[PDB]
Design a binder for this molecule. Structure first.
Ligand SMILES: *C(=O)CCCCCCCCCCCCC
Ligand SMILES: *C(=O)CCCCCCCCCCCCC
Lengths: 604, 41, 72, 72, 604, 41
């Protein structure tokens, strides 16, 4: 049973309506199921432990028995009259609301009390590493004590109550074994209150540490089910939400990104220059679109973000072409009639809006750093919005210069300030971008081995690629973490892949002389580096031309392997290299024993 | 908020209700139910 | 076998559903409160992981849930 | 009152739903087969449209469906 | 109960599983509920009637009692073990499958038998209108008979069995009253087997006809709930499906439709001519875009349809400008760089595809019809598809001419063949079009009083307007039909509106001298023509500038009135003008009595 | 088509099933149930 206890308000006959939460002057009795007593007992148990320090310091008020907050009522206990009717409990143990209040504020008040002392006991305990993980190692007690008698700073609490803290301590450190009163010798065994827990944390030499290897697994299992690593290369529309894209604002360096390497950025590849004009704040400036191609951020295929083009440390040659100086650098949109990459001359450019200029010309924004005047780090920045560009077939964001007077000097300059580190930040997660279009769902499998070397590094913050990369990256840490894809152990991961290579290379051999019986020693090893190359750089699985990894099978395969692989690790997964791991722990205890030996001499 | 009457023991627009958070009882149902392999059995 | 703690979960799971009782009736979905005592049974025998070790767990009228039930 | 023919409809309607019994269990929705005999009653009195004419229809243990039921 | 009968297969105790459809050597007994016996009895009853003709002609096989196909089993009868458990029926009457087969093929075999005779009886019966609808009117039997003894063609069956058909007849026509054997006189009352039914169809002088007025109502009620007339001016997105658009291919006459009168059709309003070229089938032709504006079907905002531009009977002046002749007329798409209505000269037109040319020049397609050579009716025709125009910001469908050699003669011609009757047929219902955009849902209330006089007649086949017109049109026939919106009876329809005008004109009077107390005699009459103008031309309610009808209240109001209005008509709704209607029926019976009077003399 | 077993009296992939239309029994559930005001009561 569970929930609050109910009782037949109509008396005797208890039906699915003659019940009612048995409330009263104390609040409502909620049932205390077996396991929920484990907690409140485990919590109180950790407080009772500090008994010797509560009396010493006259705080506290006696040991806290959980049997002081409960009661022994009886009735039907459920979550609702209907279902509570199927849990007739007699003399169960319930805790009334007003009690659920004290057991709370008591464990809270006492928790402070101890939390404090417990902190002093520690700066003194750990102040001599009472924990080794291979074999033993003593340190003659006299010295030890006479030593901490020093180190411990005058405001601890282990100097005001030595054997009032010691008695608390003995129950937390199975290192300190108190000398028995009637034989005046230790005990071999150490009996700290955490008897079992402390036994099951020792780094057992057979397998690393059960508490470790156990969690590193349940931890990975969490992720595997959580983010949705499963279904990682699913071939079908998936809401961007399914990718929980967060804290995702990637930055670049356009005016370098080739147009074909990333759809969201077209260029004005035209013969001559395209000097246009525009009255901005009265003054008339001339946008240039200089000698080179001047790659500009396209506006369509640009998920309403927060574009913030930073222009700093980048050269600013106002020294040579004086034409450049005087011009306030500024991010400006450019609506063109004919599609760009077909826009020849000025009459082609519909209009030009200065979405964000920089007050003060190019001769105050400068700063000489050895001849080559740089740009005082400043951030121009628009706030592009999907629909502010409705209808408008062609429009481009360009972080240019806005020259107040074009001249012969700036005839080979080309004032694109795009060489600066632009940082787009998708401000509306629901919508992603792929191959130049804005969508609401991705098709994972499509984005695999479909980008090129740099059609990946040039991805646009929160676009399929960047999403089908953030995803693999989780799955990449589950294998990297739990599975042993980094040793000659032909693990579950590199194993799922090997079975694909076989089934694959086996049918490609079917029909024709079949002169080559499948290899296997070579297949195991080829798939080992395939699974390994993945854990290594999760990204690669997106680039066209990557051995194994990019065939449709793998990944879809890998994950579902790694999947079941985590759901069976056992507990002693740590047996892997638990030999050198062990031998390394003995190595430490031998060096730490060496320490105790000095504590033992210096302070005799 | 139209009156109902019995469907549920409380009317919403009912007499003397009272929204009033208390730092003491942080509202919470049951999300973290453990089901992982080792822990569910 | 449905050991003590494993009933805590399925009860804690069903408990969080029963809670929504007033909305199940209102919208004619659901089908009454889900008692965990509708999926189990009261068999008795030896319960272990293998004949060898199951021999040391004679349980009488324990509460087990059959496979087809562990399904519902 | 639920005259003979008006039971034909509500039965013909429920009949077309019971049919889908195997799919209701499979998918844990539904809540058992809907018998029309769960919404009616067996009252008895005079049943008409107005006191005057209802006086000429003494029906004993007829099958009537109450308003709140005609709702479910 | 209903369904097949089940019985406890496990015996005695019948639970929700110890049941099983009681099948066997005869099939499965399905229960025969009270009403379902009414049908099979009503069907057999109509066959037994023909008893005298079955014996006469040695066919048949005795009267068909429905009690010959059933049985008296007993068990639980439901649709499934679970629910059949709540219908314990004892000695119910079930019909086994193999029986449900005969009662079927018997009623079918016999039905043919009678269907035939029953047809002969008729050509003779109705061959002297035995049905009047006001007062009576006889026709001395001798004459009548001695008359039909003539007319009836030699291959009837009423001449081979006179009083073998007569006996069947007497039961279908309460006009023929047989003379009683032991008093040798009629009976006043006529006792045809359809005693009641025939009584309740007579046009009762108090109210037209119960059978009529009753149906004309249930009929309207069907529609009202069906199509979804309710919710007719709902203000919120509605799937086009909710409008069941079918059999919907509207035709026009572009090159006339102003661009602003219908978004789906832009025009090349440019100064000079825009002669372009294109190699079509080797030969090089020149698309013209002549002197005038040349309105062309825009491609975007064009729901992938089946455009079929017919060019016939329309002038073809190859007589004057010889330039026109020789050019094969053809529907051609035109992708322009700069948006049309901004496309000045040839270099602007990206490309031109001949989506469908007409084989043979303009001098074989002609046909002289009094000087002015016309176009031999022929249909050019593309099959535009939403996505075949993906990306392509500007593209237009144009049914032009394709001149093989532009000349001075065709300098004021302008070869747009759009003056022809184009017929677009939406080939993909799911997607509609509104104000130039393609959507999947309409917002009804939006399309009311939002089109102009011709922003309606220029609507594009299966576009919101055409959908929010097909809808009102149903609701327009429900009122036109059921409700009396065509008499001074201030009906439920014109009444729902009057209450809106009041509540409306009443608050517009609130605040300020309120010198005008609402009228009402003038309001009733104004709303009467408003509801009337609607029934009249349902469309109007879309045009901006229509009195009353176009205020947001009405319609949303009207329908919900007309709604409840139909759900209460009573049965005697026909009482409306049931006076002149009656007086007109007596008028007919007086003229029909006049007929019987001649049948009575000529053939004595 | 994976075997089920009891949920429903028939397996789909079950032994000797048989798709076979007969002009005689035109398959039909219950769509035209009458509910209009006058006719439902
Ligand atoms: C009647 O329904 C009027 C609206 C009042 C309550 C509607 C929902 C908003 C308040 C929620 C109450 C339940 C938990 C939020
Ligand atoms: C297992 O599910 C394999 C697929 C066989 C049946 C799937 C559905 C197609 C056949 C329908 C049978 C029920 C009525 C069509």
């Amino acid at each position: 049973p569970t929930g609050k206890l109910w009782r037949p308000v109509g008396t005797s006959v208890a039906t699915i309506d003659s019940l009612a939460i048995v409330s009263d002057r104390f609040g409502q009795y909620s049932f205390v199921n077996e396991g929920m007593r484990e907690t409140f007992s485990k919590a109180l148990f950790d407080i009772n432990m500090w008994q010797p320090l509560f009396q010493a310091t006259k705080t506290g008020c006696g040991p806290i028995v959980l049997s002081s907050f409960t009661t022994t009522t009886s009735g039907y206990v459920g979550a609702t009259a209907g279902d509570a009717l199927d849990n007739p409990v007699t003399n169960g143990v319930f805790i009334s609301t007003v009690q659920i209040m004290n057991l709370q504020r008591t464990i809270a008040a006492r928790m402070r009390d101890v939390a404090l002392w417990q902190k002093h006991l520690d700066t003194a305990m750990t102040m001599l590493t009472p924990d080794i993980s291979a074999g033993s190692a003593s340190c003659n007690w006299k010295s030890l004590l006479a030593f901490a008698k020093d180190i411990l700073p005058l405001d601890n609490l282990c100097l005001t109550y030595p054997n009032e803290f010691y008695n608390v301590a003995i129950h937390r450190y199975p290192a300190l074994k108190p000398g028995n009163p009637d034989t005046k010798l230790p005990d071999a065994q150490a009996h700290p209150l955490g008897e079992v827990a402390g036994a099951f944390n020792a780094a057992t030499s057979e397998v690393g540490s059960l508490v470790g290897s156990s969690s590193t697994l349940s931890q990975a299992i969490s992720t595997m089910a959580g983010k949705d690593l499963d279904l990682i290369e699913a071939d079908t529309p998936l809401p961007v939400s399914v990718f929980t894209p967060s804290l995702a604002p990637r930055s670049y360096r356009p005016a370098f990104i080739k147009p074909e390497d990333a759809k969201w950025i077209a260029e004005f590849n035209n013969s001559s220059l395209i000097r246009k004009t525009l009255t901005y704040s009265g003054a008339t400036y001339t946008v240039q679109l200089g000698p080179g191609p001047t790659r500009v951020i396209d506006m369509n295929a640009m998920i309403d973000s927060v574009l913030t083009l930073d222009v700093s440390g980048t050269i600013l040659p106002y020294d040579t072409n004086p034409d450049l100086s005087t011009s306030v650098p500024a991010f400006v949109l450019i609506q063109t009639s004919v599609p760009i990459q077909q826009v020849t001359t000025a009459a082609n450019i519909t209009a030009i809006t200065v979405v964000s200029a920089a007050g003060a010309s190019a001769i105050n924004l400068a700063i000489n750093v050895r001849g080559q005047p740089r740009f005082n780090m400043l951030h121009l920045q628009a706030t592009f919005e999907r629909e502010t560009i409705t209808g408008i077939p062609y429009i481009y964001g360009l972080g240019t210069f806005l020259i107040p007077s074009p001249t012969s000097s700036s005839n080979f300059s080309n004032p694109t300030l795009m060489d600066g580190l632009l940082t787009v930040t998708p401000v509306l997660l629901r919508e992603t971008t792929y191959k130049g279009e804005v969508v609401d769902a991705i098709v994972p499998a499509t984005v695999m081995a479909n980008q090129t070397s740099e059609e990946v590094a040039s991805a646009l913050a929160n676009d399929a690629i960047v999403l089908v990369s953030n995803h693999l990256n989780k799955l990449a840490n589950v294998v990297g973490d739990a599975i042993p894809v980094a040793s000659r152990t032909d693990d579950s991961a590199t194993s799922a892949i090997v079975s694909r290579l076989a089934v694959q290379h086996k049918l490609s051999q079917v029909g024709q002389a079949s002169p080559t019986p499948p290899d296997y020693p070579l297949l195991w090893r080829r798939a080992k580096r395939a699974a390994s190359m993945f854990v290594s750089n999760p990204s690669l699985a997106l680039q066209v031309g990557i051995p194994v990894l990019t065939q449709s099978g793998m990944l879809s395969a890998l994950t579902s392997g790694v999947g079941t692989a985590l759901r069976t690790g056992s507990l002693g997964k740590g047996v892997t290299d638990a030999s050198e791991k062990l031998r390394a722990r003995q190595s430490l205890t031998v060096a730490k024993q060496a320490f105790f030996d000095q504590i033992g001499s210096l302070w005799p | 908020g139209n009156v109902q009457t019995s469907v549920n023991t409380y009317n919403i627009t009912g007499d003397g209700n009272s929204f009033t958070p208390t730092s003491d009882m942080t509202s919470t149902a049951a999300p973290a139910i453990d089901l992982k392999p080792g822990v569910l059995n």
